[PDB]
Each structure stands twice: as structure tokens, then as C-alpha cells.
């Protein structure tokens, strides 16, 4: 569906990176959070749900994702949580690769993280008719709106 996201935390440095991936498109959003806590994850989730359609989030059983703060956010925004595909592991590694390629272009890791998110979402697949991840998610959502 155009609302299914996968969320996880990764680490690089000694800092915490919260990563979100739109499963259908490969589009990602990430951010360095001061601590791997439910409060930070909940604030991250509220922001995401206000930018994109977030109907279901898939996460592991980390305490930050099971926190009451995240359950509150999901209730307020109407998000169904699924704690049950390696779509996210395939992306967290690709985020780490891009970060390394561009690390020297920024002092702070958080700056490099956003550069990597930028590059990953805007690249574009080389072939005939190729699209970027950012274009795929927009297309997926656009078509869903027409069927309303």
C-alpha cells in the first residue's frame, strides 16, 4: 500500500540514526536523534505522518518502538503498528555506504546523513524509463489519490 513504512535504528561515530523506508518505493527518511528513546522516535513519527501518508509502520521490538510515546503518536495519527522482508536492512546498509562516500563533505554526521538521504532519494535508476525513489513514492501516492 502507499502507507506501509519500515522503521529501524542504526549506529555510526557513536550516534543514533533513526531510519524510515517507504517499502513500495525505496524512498527513505533518516535523522540523527540525541538518544534512542521512545520520545525521540515518537516525535520523528509525528513529523513523518504529517508529510507522507503513514498508515502502517513495521518495526522490531526495540524499546523505543514499543514505548507508550510511540503508541500515543500512532493512536493520534491513526497508524497501525506491526512488530513482525529485508527492505529496511537493504536500505540501512545503502545509507551507510552513501554516508561514507560523502562523509568528507561535512563536519557533522547529521549533515552527512541528510546528504545521503538526498542522494538516495534523488539519484534515478539508469535505464530507459528510470525513476528515482522520490519519484516512485510520489507516483504511488498520486495514483492512490485518483482512486478516491
Amino acid at each position: 500500500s502507499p502507507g506501509i513504512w519500515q522503521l529501524d535504528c542504526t549506529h555510526l561515530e557513536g550516534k543514533v540514526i533513526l531510519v524510515a523506508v517507504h517499502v513500495a518505493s525505496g524512498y527513505i527518511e533518516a535523522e540523527v536523534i540525541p538518544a534512542e528513546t521512545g520520545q525521540e522516535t515518537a516525535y520523528f513519527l509525528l513529523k513523518l505522518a504529517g508529510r507522507w501518508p503513514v498508515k502502517t509502520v513495521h518495526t522490531d521490538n526495540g524499546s523505543n518502538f514499543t514505548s507508550t510515546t510511540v503508541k500515543a503518536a500512532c493512536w493520534w495519527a491513526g497508524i497501525k503498528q506491526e512488530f513482525g522482508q529485508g527492505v529496511i536492512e537493504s536500505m540501512n546498509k545503502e545509507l551507510k555506504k552513501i554516508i561514507g562516500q560523502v562523509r568528507d563533505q561535512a563536519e557533522h554526521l547529521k549533515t552527512a546523513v541528510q546528504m545521503a538521504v538526498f542522494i538516495h532519494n534523488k539519484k534515478r535508476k539508469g535505464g530507459i524509463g528510470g525513476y528515482s525513489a522520490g519519484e516512485r513514492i510520489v507516483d504511488i501516492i498520486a495514483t492512490d489519490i485518483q482512486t478516491k
Binding site: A49, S67, T68, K71, A72, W75, W76, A77, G78
Partner: protein, 57 residues
């Protein structure tokens, strides 16, 4: 307008919930977690309304 409550019991740091809201008083909130009804000081309870979900089903 369905509300959900997350709370801490006195002398217990573990946040609990989701719980249903039965009444919201000035200094206390009456709730129902599973089947047990509880009176929690207003300061130890977070009442969450599904406001976002209602903005565009």
C-alpha cells in the same frame, strides 16, 4: 472522539497503557486498563485523542 490513556501507577516508573478513559476530573482521571478500573492523578496520565486520524480517514 475515542480517547486513550497512558499512565504511571504511583511509585512505579513503568508507563502503562493503552487504557480507556471513563472520566476526567480536575485532579484525577478514572480509566480502565484491560478490566481493572483505576483512579490516577491527572499529572500521572497522558490522554490521547485520535484527532489526526479524524482529520482525513
Amino acid at each position: 472522539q475515542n480517547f486513550r490513556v497512558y499512565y504511571r501507577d504511583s511509585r512505579d516508573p513503568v508507563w502503562k497503557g493503552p487504557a480507556k478513559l471513563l472520566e476526567k476530573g480536575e485532579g484525577a482521571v478514572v480509566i480502565q486498563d484491560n478490566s481493572d478500573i483505576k483512579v490516577v492523578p491527572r499529572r500521572k496520565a497522558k490522554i490521547i485523542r485520535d484527532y489526526g486520524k479524524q482529520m482525513a480517514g
